[PDB]
Design a binder for this molecule. Structure first.
Ligand code: SF4
Ligand SMILES: [Zn+2]
Ligand SMILES: [Zn+2]
Lengths: 98, 41, 131, 752
């Protein structure tokens, strides 16, 4: 929750870890709580879908999320999304019923 | 392990032979048991 | 039929020096070790279950493409193109005749690959060799 | 206002006008009247789009020729801004001339941006959207429904409702932005995509992206409808070479070929199935192929080829099908053994770079595939798929890649290279071979444009140096110049930071990204600027991987915790929609005074059209020079090609590429002359690139700011922000930076 990369070596606590998978479900429920159509002025999705048949050269590894030797994600994008979600939730909470 | 390594089979062991088993006259002495050795920082 | 000789069951893990070869006659994979012992003395029937087509050790080669069917087509294509071979200039720039000639050659290759009419087609290949 | 050029009356939609805008308009008219191309570089703090539309629209409406206009932007988001400006300009004209003149202006984009079908617009990729729309609009469904009403094939009410009305009555006269276009079409159940595509021949001005002018796949259909005498505007064309190169490039992976064999086998099975029950279709196609017809004469205007033409239309052979691939089974065998050759070429153990000729020669040797049939691969496959009734084409999708590769490598031989690498990612346990077909010359894709159209205007805010674009892209210009903004009081403070407060050098070199001193020095600069920046602060990084690593390092150091107290942290992510949500949040936090900081990539999605003006941008933090990854086979090949052909030194191009992106991000902070912000270039290597910055940015960069420290930059920023918060004296800008009608007339009198 602090936006820190989890270390496998760290023992943690047995009781609280049971809620880790539940949080993975709350984040999904929160991603939809924030998702909504975006104005075309700053819609970055339409720029990549402007020409759906673009086939060029795949970008270098410096222009892609980091991966490990085995090929799976290193996990730094998750904390980037976590802070992104924290800011989005704070701003959305401002526009409450009051 | 050497014989297995000649046939192309990866040997899961090693030859044990490769296991590398790893002043004088002082001035002031009335401070007999006070001076702690802070040699490095 | 994954990485081991179907005859001797010599897996690649225990014999990393294993190397396979194919014979155009039946395109059956076989490791080099079996080739020497079965064919060194002379011609013998293929050591496969259901295959009785004799072959010689001197004919074995290395498979180029990972697909056996394409290997058969390419080798037949090489055999036909060694006989049926012309160019656009051979018909004085007549593209219609050249395209028809190309279609006929493809039909010949298709028939030889799938055995539609082996006897008539094979004779035609032999006949055109004289001309 | 409504002022006059030599004989052209032009109606500006504002009562005031900048001196730069008038000079910009005068130069554009001079280029239009004299004919030819020009490269104009106007600052970002001056209205460029409004000036272009004002003059060009007036030019088309006054002269007898009534030349049309083609407006090319780089992203879809820019088309909206251009259309909004066009609507504002035309509304002013309708109110000053007393009537709405006959005028039509439409934007153009893909189906994904304009699909109103409740079940087809819910897709996450545009290729699927096109497939489903084609299934309901190709005409197969309509013909089957005509013969037998009981058929369950569905249609699109939007597409069908258009047939009732005529093409001239799809939309009312005026300018339609996408926001307005979708609203109008929803109330009448019409397809905006098909309305736009069927009205390009009637538009006075058509606005689309560069991919619809340079990419042969989507360009040929659109290009055939526009006029030949139209005015062509290249807006924000400082990175047009990248678009030109990706149009004739392709990449093949082991997964692609493994998925291609399955499709070829499925295609052979489908042919066998069709052979047994319905064989007249095959003979009918074969008969027309023998005659000499191609896709154009066989396919109806309603249907589209399965494989988009991957080469420029001028390089397609006009002769009949060679005959080898004339029959279905022969073509399938031809296709299968081509795939096998590609697979056996993926087993190399070292990087191999070869010309298309060498690849063709080896192909002709191992197998017996000649060049000419390989050129018809894409054309033939579209016919075979069309005649096979392939209602679901999920299996055959992979074959579009093989066909595209086949038609490219057999067409071009100069300016193209084929790189095969055993490691797409060098940091991998198991090699993953890749095969890249790269375009080295950037002028091959833009050659048709500069010959088809007489007058072309290449304009951008940061297009410098201007000599290199004629060099890189083989075209010549009647005039190329850059304007310097006549700002009464300095409004932007460009600074270069070379070291930290400890005087240790700072750089974004990738090899020292994980350095405790450089990481902490950059983090301290980020925090200190976050303390004095009032509303918004954008930070651009050389690459996404560099940003990911350094941000993670900051988290451990605790630098982020200090930033969180003053501003919200929004980060650019690979997902486009999530980044769009981040932009929405970042703008919201800037407006309500909460303060926000946006971390993005200099060469990413944010930098290619999103503008951070007024409160959305008050400080720009360029963390390092955005260099490419030098150890890239594609870039090294391109650098070698440019050196031998255009005599461009490798270091010169690399610096030019990096600066054109750094300047690109700098210019997205000023909209008018009442806008201000601080531009800091944080890299020791920036200190010698002042002469490489745009003229209007270089003029504002002082000799004392060429190599500053973090503390000295903070002190200057605090003084500058305090100075820009004071009420400006109107007399200081009454007639030197902003012009009324009377001032403009004076400028026309003294000059003459
Ligand atoms: S016709 Fe238009 S609305 Fe209907 S599916 Fe196609 S793109 Fe979507
Ligand atoms: Zn064997
Ligand atoms: Zn056999």
């Amino acid at each position: 929750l602090r936006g820190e990369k989890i270390m496998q070596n760290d023992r943690g606590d047995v009781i609280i870890d049971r809620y880790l998978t539940l949080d993975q479900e709350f984040d999904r429920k929160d991603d939809d709580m924030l998702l909504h159509p975006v104005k075309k002025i700053i819609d970055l999705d339409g720029n990549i879908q402007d020409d759906p048949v673009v086939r060029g050269n795949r970008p270098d590894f410096t222009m892609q999320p980091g991966v490990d030797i085995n090929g799976n994600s290193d996990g730094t994008v998750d904390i980037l999304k976590g802070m992104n979600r924290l800011s989005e939730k704070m701003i959305m909470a401002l526009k409450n019923e009051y | 392990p050497r014989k297995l390594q000649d046939l192309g089979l990866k040997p899961a062991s090693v030859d044990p032979a490769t296991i590398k088993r790893q002043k004088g006259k002082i001035t002031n002495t009335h401070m007999t048991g006070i001076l702690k050795d802070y040699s490095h920082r | 039929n994954k990485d081991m000789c179907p005859i001797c069951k010599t897996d690649r893990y225990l014999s990393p020096d294993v190397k396979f070869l194919v014979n155009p006659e039946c395109y059956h994979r076989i490791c080099e070790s079996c080739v020497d012992r079965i064919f060194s003395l002379g011609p013998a029937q293929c050591p496969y279950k259901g295959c009785d087509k004799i072959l010689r050790k001197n004919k074995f080669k290395t498979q180029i493409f990972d697909d056996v069917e394409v290997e058969k087509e390419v080798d037949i294509r090489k055999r036909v193109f060694n006989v049926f071979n012309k160019t656009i200039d051979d018909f004085n720039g007549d593209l219609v005749e050249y395209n028809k000639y190309l279609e006929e050659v493809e039909d010949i290759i298709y028939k030889l690959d799938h055995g539609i009419d082996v006897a008539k087609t094979e004779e035609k290949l032999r006949t055109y060799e004289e001309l | 206002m409504k002022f006059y050029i030599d004989d052209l009356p032009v109606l500006f939609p504002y009562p005031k006008i900048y001196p730069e805008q008038y000079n910009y308009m005068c130069d554009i008219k001079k280029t239009l009247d004299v004919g030819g191309n020009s490269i104009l570089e106007m600052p970002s703090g001056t209205g460029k789009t409004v000036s272009l539309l004002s003059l060009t629209i007036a030019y088309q409406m006054h002269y007898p020729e009534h030349r049309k206009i083609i407006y090319c932007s780089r992203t879809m988001s820019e088309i909206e801004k251009a259309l909004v400006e066009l609507e504002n300009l035309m509304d002013y004209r309708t109110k000053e001339l007393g009537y709405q003149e006959d005028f039509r202006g439409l934007g153009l984009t893909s189906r994904k941006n304009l699909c109103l079908h409740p079940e087809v617009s819910k897709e996450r990729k545009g290729t699927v959207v096109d497939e489903k729309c084609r299934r309901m609009t190709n005409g197969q469904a309509k013909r089957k429904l005509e013969e037998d009403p009981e058929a369950n094939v569905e249609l699109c009410e939007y597409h069908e409702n258009l047939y009732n009305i005529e093409v001239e009555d799809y939309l009312p006269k005026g300018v339609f932005s996408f926001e307005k276009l979708l609203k109008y079409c929803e109330e009448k159940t019409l397809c905006p995509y098909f309305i736009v595509r069927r009205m390009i021949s009637l538009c006075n001005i058509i606005i689309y992206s560069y991919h619809y002018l340079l990419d042969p796949k989507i360009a040929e259909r659109v290009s055939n409808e526009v006029s030949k005498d139209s005015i062509v505007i290249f807006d924000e064309a400082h990175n047009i070479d990248n678009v030109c190169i990706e149009s004739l490039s392709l990449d093949l992976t082991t997964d692609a070929l493994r998925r291609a064999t399955r499709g070829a086998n499925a295609l052979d099975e489908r042919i066998s199935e069709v052979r047994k029950v319905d064989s007249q279709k095959l003979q009918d196609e074969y008969e027309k192929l023998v005659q000499g017809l191609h896709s154009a004469d066989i396919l109806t205007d309603q249907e589209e080829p399965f494989v988009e033409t991957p080469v420029l239309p001028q390089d397609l052979l006009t002769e009949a099908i060679p005959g080898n691939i004339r029959r279905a089974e022969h073509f399938v065998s031809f296709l299968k053994r081509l795939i096998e050759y590609l697979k056996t070429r993926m087993k190399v153990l070292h990087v191999i770079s070869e010309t298309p000729k060498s690849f063709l020669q080896h192909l002709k040797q191992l197998t017996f595939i000649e060049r000419k049939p390989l050129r018809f691969c894409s054309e033939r496959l579209s016919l075979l798929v069309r005649t096979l009734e392939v209602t679901e084409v999920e299996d055959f999708t992979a074959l579009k890649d093989i066909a595209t590769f086949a038609t490219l490598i057999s067409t071009y031989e100069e300016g193209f290279l084929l790189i095969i690498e055993p490691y797409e990612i060098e940091n991998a346990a198991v090699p993953n071979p890749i095969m890249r077909f790269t375009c080295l010359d950037a002028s091959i894709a833009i050659k048709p444009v500069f010959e088809r159209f007489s007058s072309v205007i290449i304009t951008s805010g940061t297009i410098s140096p201007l000599d290199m674009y004629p060099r890189m892209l083989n075209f010549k210009t009647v005039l190329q110049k850059s304007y310097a903004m006549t700002l009464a009081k300095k409004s932007f403070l460009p600074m270069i930071i070379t070291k930290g407060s400890d005087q240790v050098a700072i750089s974004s070199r990738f090899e020292i990204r994980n350095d405790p001193s450089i990481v902490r020095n950059y983090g301290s600069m980020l925090v200190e600027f976050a303390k004095i920046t009032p509303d918004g602060m954008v930070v651009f990084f050389p690459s996404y991987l560099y940003m990911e690593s350094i941000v993670s390092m900051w988290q451990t150091m605790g630098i982020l915790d200090e930033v969180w107290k003053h501003k919200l942290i929004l980060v650019e992510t690979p997902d486009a929609q999530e980044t769009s949500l981040a932009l929405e949040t970042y703008r919201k936090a800037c407006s309500n005074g909460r303060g926000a900081i946006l971390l993005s990539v200099a060469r990413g999605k944010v930098s290619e059209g999103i503008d951070f003006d007024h409160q959305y941008g008050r400080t720009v933090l360029m963390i390092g020079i955005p260099f490419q990854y030098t150890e890239s086979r594609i870039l090294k090949a391109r650098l070698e090609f440019m050196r031998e052909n255009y005599r461009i030194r490798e270091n010169d191009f690399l610096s030019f590429d990096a600066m054109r992106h750094a300047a690109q991000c700098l210019g997205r902070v000023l909209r008018g002359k009442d806008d201000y912000g601080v531009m800091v270039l944080a890299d020791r290597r920036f200190s010698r690139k002042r002469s490489q910055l745009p003229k209007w940015i270089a003029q504002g960069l002082s000799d004392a700011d060429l190599n500053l420290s973090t503390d000295m930059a903070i002190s200057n920023t605090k003084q500058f922000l305090r100075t820009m918060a004071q009420p400006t004296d109107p007399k200081d800008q009454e007639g030197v930076s902003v012009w009324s009608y009377e001032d403009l007339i004076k400028h026309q009198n003294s000059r003459k």
